[PDB]
Amino acid sequence: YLASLIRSVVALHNLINNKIANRDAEKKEGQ
Amino acid sequence: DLYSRYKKLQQELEFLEVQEEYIKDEQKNLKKEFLHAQEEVKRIQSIPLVIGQFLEAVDQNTAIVGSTTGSNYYVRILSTIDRELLKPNASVALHKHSNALV
Amino acid sequence: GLRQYYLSKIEELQLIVNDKSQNLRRLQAQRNELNAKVRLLREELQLLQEQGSYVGEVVRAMDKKKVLVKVHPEGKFVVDVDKNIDINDVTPNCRVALRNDSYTLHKILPNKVDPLVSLMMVEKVPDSTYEMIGG
Amino acid sequence: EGLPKNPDLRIAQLRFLLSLPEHRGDAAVRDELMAAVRDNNMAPYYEALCKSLDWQIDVDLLNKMKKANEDELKRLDEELEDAEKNLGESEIRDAMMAKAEYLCRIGDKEGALTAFRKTYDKTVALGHRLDIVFYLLRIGLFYMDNDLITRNTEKAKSLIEEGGDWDRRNRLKVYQGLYCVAIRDFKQAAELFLDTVSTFTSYELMDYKTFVTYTVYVSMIALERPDLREKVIKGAEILEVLHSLPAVRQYLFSLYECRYSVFFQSLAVVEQEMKKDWLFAPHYRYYVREMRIHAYSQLLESYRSLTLGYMAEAFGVGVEFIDQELSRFIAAGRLHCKIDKVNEIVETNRPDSKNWQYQETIKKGDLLLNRVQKLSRVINM
Amino acid sequence: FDYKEQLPESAYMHQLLGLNLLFLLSQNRVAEFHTELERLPAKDIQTNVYIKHPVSLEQYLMEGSYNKVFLAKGNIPAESYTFFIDILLDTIRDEIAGCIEKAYEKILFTEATRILFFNTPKKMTDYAKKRGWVLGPNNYYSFASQTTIPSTELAKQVIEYARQLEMI
Amino acid sequence: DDEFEEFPAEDWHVWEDNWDDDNVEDDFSNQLRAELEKH
Amino acid sequence: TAAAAAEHSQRELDTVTLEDIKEHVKQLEKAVSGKEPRFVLRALRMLPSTSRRLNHYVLYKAVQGFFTSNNATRDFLLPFLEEPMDTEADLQFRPRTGKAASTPLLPEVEAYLQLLVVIFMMNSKRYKEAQKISDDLMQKISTQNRRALDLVAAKCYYYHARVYEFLDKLDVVRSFLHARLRTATLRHDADGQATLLNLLLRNYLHYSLYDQAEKLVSKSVFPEQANNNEWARYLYYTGRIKAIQLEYSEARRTMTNALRKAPQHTAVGFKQTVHKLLIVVELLLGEIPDRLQFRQPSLKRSLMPYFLLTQAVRTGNLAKFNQVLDQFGEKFQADGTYTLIIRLRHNVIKTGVRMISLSYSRISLADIAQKLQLDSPEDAEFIVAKAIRDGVIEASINHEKGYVQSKEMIDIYSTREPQLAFHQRISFCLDIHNMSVKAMRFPPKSAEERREREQQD
Amino acid sequence: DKKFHGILDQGEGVLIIFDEPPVDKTYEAALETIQNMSKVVDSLYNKAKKLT
Amino acid sequence: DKDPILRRSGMYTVAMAYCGSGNNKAIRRLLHVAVSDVNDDVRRAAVESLGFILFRTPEQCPSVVSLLSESYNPHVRYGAAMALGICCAGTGNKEAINLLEPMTNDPVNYVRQGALIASALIMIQQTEITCPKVNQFRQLYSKVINDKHDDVMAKFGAILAQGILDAGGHNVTISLQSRTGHTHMPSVVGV
After folding, report:
1. Which of D223, G116, G154, G390 is the most buried (most CB within 10 A)?
2. Which residues contact residue D259 at a Cβ distance below 8 angstroms, ignoring those fewer than 6 apart?
3. Which value, to the nearest 10 degrees, does the dihedral of the CA atoms of residues D154, D160, D161, D163 take?
């Protein structure tokens, strides 16, 4: 359970980073 | 025109069946070949290579290394190398001929 | 009635093709990323056998796109700059990579430690402030 | 000596007292607070306090304080401009730091904060940066700004790490222990207070008597018997200050050596003063409950069974009251026994610590899983 | 319920609705009971005796207040409620007997009569023969008849964990 | 996005949030005083 | 010149809102041209702000020019919309003079503008011409049939249902709304289907036809591809239905999901209602709400009655419970909870029994009755026996001596319960990881070097 | 004072002595890790909601 | 069958049997073999077989051939190039030409050869206005031929490409189906 929770938090961090990169790229393209 | 939308029916079948499983097995075999490619690029770590010191990192895939022969070179670094081990002044293994951080 | 029949099934199929197209574009993106990664590795094995590039410090920039460079640890050459670096950016006392055969300045590496910085690091005068001073 | 009492925490104490319903009208408290207000020309703070407490604004006094504050601010801005033009960076910093100091001394939270941020931007001395950070931390204690407190605590830790000022490190220990007491983190409060008991110098916050009182309270509620024995019951400084203090020494030693029902009169008096105190006020009920649970556990640990009659005799309380209290705590799950009521007798048991750890793991994992799921919904959509 | 307005309502409405609630309770359709009960207006549920007796009877049944459930037999705000209440009493006798089965490591007879709300030892003996008891060899109905790792289910769960981890 | 106007609205502590401080009870000082007085 | 200054401020706001609606309608026609509907969702995201700024007959100033090819609309819109615009106003700002190519206005844009008219009537608080014009819009959209039109149709459906809500007669819409739900289910439009189902469930709840709503939920399938707000409303309605039908676990999960999916910056009324009912449902299952809800400023005075209810139930004595009932019934009728709260009476019985069993090994039946604050000890007897049967308690009753002796509380960690708890948690964590990995969106994405390498070699 | 794990039965007048099991370090580390990862999740709030 | 040559024979047999039919089962089999089978020659043969099967609808091939051309295996890329050439032979498909243009100047001699040959097959009997890439590809062919950088197989591809472009005195087109819509068996066999 501890490892699964840690993995879930890491996956959420990866998703946050991916969405941040996506918005940055889209905004730069729109610029 | 509406039986042309039946043409669109067969178009839908074409997208659905032909391409989905195609990409599925394509990415499966691409994972297989990725493992094979990593094991192949291991080839550059051949035993007879010269030792050096990792001075500075320029890019994610390039760095300056002082070879033990006396000179120092700005050269690419193997991707399959733990960058946490590239501490300052850390001893590294440079390719004998290409002189890259292997 | 049959016109409505057709248009109904046609719209059903339009929805099916639309969602399947989103799905297939996602799958194609995944596949392209993986294939690019693998191709990058396989070309990496090939392009790591290239000669490593020397590192030399520019001492003076000539005309006609040539730069006087001291290559570590022996040798002072004049190298033609590559056609990707504005010669105006090779100001003296800066590290630059030189291609192995036929030395050719092809990159401006991060600047060497300033001689003054090195001298002050050797001298090691402890940093001070008025609040450390008292009396 | 300690850092300046610019955001005087005694003013916050008096405001909290006047906020309490049994002191909303205390003549002495009101008069002392007004003495401080008129002595420091707290015009903005006086206006805000009158608004909050529904008092009548003494327009004449407010106007005179406002004129005094405006004159001071104008004069000190003139000094700042003179330092800008003629004098150097150190003089500029001194002038604008004085402006921040006066904006605190007139209880102007936002202006003082902005002035301190500008001063910290324009300051070059690590010690002076720590002084500014401690000013901000004291403002945070005054206004119970938890975000400000945590941010400035991290800032102070970072600044101390370089420089290694142990005096500043001990001062930060005292400040962080005060914050931990405020937020009901008694374990860390006791840890910090015991670390800094022999090096306390922060008189800007509170006297050594009150510091040792708080240290003894948090140590009793947090530490186990061996640690309490080694630290509080034998620390030379704690023992001397407890010799000075007639009451808290009796409270601590009664708890330690099992003199019961005197522990309860002590707990009642300390509860009253805890309720009076602004720092311990929204934790006095919790502290009393925890101390009662600790006393019951201490009495019950060394006996397989113990009659409710014996419990009541030891604690001086009645059998029915001790029975109801004990049953309440057992239902809460903070006592390791059961009580047989047909023939009153309390029988203890020894549940393995694995059960407690599993319950705590489930609870904390549920909190963190709820947080993770909330984050997931926030991001995915 | 349908034709609100255009109708002046019937005084018998609340009585008959309470009778319907009694019927639902007797047949033990609690969900439908509560659903229809929600139809009754607030003050009708709270004050009107005809709607209070059914809801109160369900409250007592859920709590286990079988004494007050039995006293409902005397309460009976409308005599027509007897029919739907007798069957509920018999079902409640069964439920009480189940409570007795699970609890009461040992129980006697003279008091078990009042516990089961019976009034005749012949009825007691017939009911004991129903299901089955020990008859009280010492006048005590001693119905005190109170490992195996779920390895298969646990292995299925662990394999599910593995599959959910490896389909990445 | 949506203000959720379908429904009406009625005009309108970093420590662990526990449901035990809520008990309605006189101060422990008062409780102990009463117990001692009746003792 | 306060009047003139206010008029000028109003006129500049009119220009701003006019250009805003220009941009919105532009989005609409470019959406229908490009075949991508969600552009209409982007346009419709600002219905609240547009409605808030939709006053002073700015929509008159607009429609008088827009609605040039659909003169059949003026006959109704203008008489209800008056002619309050100043004589000249020196503006003359229109869609190229309200004239592009004599083309009929796109049905989506016409529906959008007429929805603006309907919501302006909503704000004006005159719900008769609003009803008539809403019926006219319904006829228009029923005649029309377009995919990009489904979103505006959904918004129109919701606002028309709101008009009839204010009319106080929703049973009249019942038939038309339900038939149009059937139409939107036959034609696969998830947004329309979801909104229609939500409005039908709201009507059923308003008339207290929980059994009807139960069948509707059972035999209707909600579209999984619905927005967070329709999901929140549907989950709330389903949770209330389950709570009344005595499916408390389903009530808890659906209602918690509704709270989580509701917007967190607005919808204070929805949050208050969901928190109240969820507090009731938790308290009914036995789980007790956390103090965070009652500490929340948004909803604190609203939950005080429920706060005292929670205190009473958790304390576990029917005295405090029934006094609390007595004081705070009125709010419980303003909301509607009698059945749930008296099921909570039973649950306070259960909680008192649980506390007594946990804290006591042996205790007389009279003491149990006293601590449960019950009637005669025989009732406490039967309650305790029923609890032991149900499994609330594991104890055994000694009637001869008239007490209750509890079990030894078999060490749980040596059983499978920790495995089950950790299994639920592990499954959910793995689900979170899988959902995140699936959600990660990957955005779409030299030979001179090749030749140079070949030549240098 | 925890100098030995036992309990004093006054009634009979005996001294029961328990071979108290050691405290599991795995659960201690798991709880501390849960706390630290809660700090991590707070930092993730700070990054996401402020940026996202 | 065990033999890779027998497997390639199976791929070609599928191609011939289902030529023009666009049978989804044949497409599935050929594409799965091109993906997962362990021999590069048969992978290339499978891609070419898919090209054969899809010529009645030249608009469909571009997608799959693009996915297989911006791809992993040099043989798979080459097979995609020939699939495009076979599919669009005589059509001058702008999409196919755009797909093949990057393929030229690929890091593989035979891949460049196949891309050039397929490009010429597509622009068979074409002109500038019909498709604005004929001059680009003609000058590319000429430079490749009169260069020494390029590999011998790239030179072979360029010569064959010029021959195809100017095939039949530039008075002939390659169509796998007759002008009346009947599959042209001589053309299928020839290709």
Report:
1. G154
2. D253
3. 160
- Is residue D229 a contact partner of residue D256, using CB atoms and an 8 Å limit? yes
The three-state DSSP-derived secondary structure of chain C is CHHHHHHHHHHHHHHHHHHHHHHHHHHHHHHHHHHHHHHHHHHHHHHCCCCCEEEEEEEEECCCCEEEEEECCCCEEEEEECCCCCHHHCCCCEEEEECCCCCEEEEECCCCCCHHHHHHHHHCCCCCCCCCCCC
Bridge-partner residues for G16, per DSSP? none
Question: Which residue has tokens 């030299």?
Answer: G446
How far apart, in whole angstroms, are the C-alpha atoms of residue I27 and residue I119?
23
DSSP assignment of G44-111 equals HTTHHHHHHT--TTHHHHHHHHHTTS-TTTHHHHHHHH---S-S-TT----STTT-SSSPPPPHHHHH
Question: How many beta carbons lie within 10 A of that of residue B82, not counting itself?
Answer: 6
Within 8 A of H1 by CB-CB distance, chain D residues are 225-226, 229
Residue D56 DSSP one-character state = P
Distance of CA E45 to the CA centre of its chain: 20
Between CA E76 and CA G348 the distance in angstroms is 27
Query: What are the boundaries of each domain within chain E?
Result: 1-164
- For residue I64 the two structure tokens come to 């799959």
Whether the bond into C73 is cis, omega within 30 of 0: yes
Q: Distance from E22 to chain G by nearest Cα, in Å?
A: 16
Look up the domain containing G280 and give its range: 236-365
- Phi then psi for residue G396, to 5 deg, are -135, 140
Experimental technique used?
cryo-EM
DSSP label of E62: H
**Tokens standing for D29?**
């408290």
Resolution (A): 2.9
C131 touches chain D (CB under 8 A): yes
CA atoms of G193 and F1, how far apart (whole Å): 20
A17 at interface of D, judged by CB pairs closer than 8 A: no
Question: How is residue G320 written in tokens?
Answer: 């405090």
Residue type, I139: Q
**What is the extent of the structural domain holding F14?**
1-39
Closest CA to D134 of D91, D101, D162, D110: D101
Are G241 and G306 part of one and the same domain?
A: yes
DSSP designation for D204: T
Under the phi-then-psi rule, with left for phi > 0, alpha for psi from -120 to 50, and beta for the rest, what region is E141?
beta
Residue E122 CB-density burial (10 A; 0-12 exposed, 13-18 middle, 19+ buried): exposed
Number of H helices, E strands in chain H: 1, 2
Inspect the structure and tell me whether chains A and H have 3 or more CB pairs less than 8 Å apart.
Answer: yes
- Closest-CA distance of chain D to residue H32, Å: 10
Cβ-based contacts of E115 with chain G (< 8 Å)? 399
The secondary element (H helix, E strand) that includes residue G404 is strand G403-405
Residues G355 and G411 reside in one and the same domain = no
The C-alpha atoms of residue E99 and residue G385 are separated, in whole angstroms, by: 6
Find the Cα–Cα–Cα–Cα dihedral E88, E94, E98, E99, rounded to 10°: 50
Residue I14: HSE in the Cβ half-sphere, 13 Å Cα cutoff: 28
Give per-residue burial for C27-47: e unless 16+ CB within 10 Å, then b.
bbbbbbebbeebbebbebbee
> Which chains would you list as touching E if contact means 3+ CB atom pairs under 8 Å?
G
Facing residues of B75 across strands? Answer: B63
Number of domains composing chain F: 1
Report the distance separating Cα E135 and Cα E140, nearest Å.
7
Of chain I residues 6-65, which have a CB less than 8 A from chain B?
A: 24, 27-28, 31-32, 35-36, 60, 63-64
Chain B residue nearest residue I27, CA to CA: B18
Neighbours of chain I (3+ CB pairs under 8 A): B, C, G
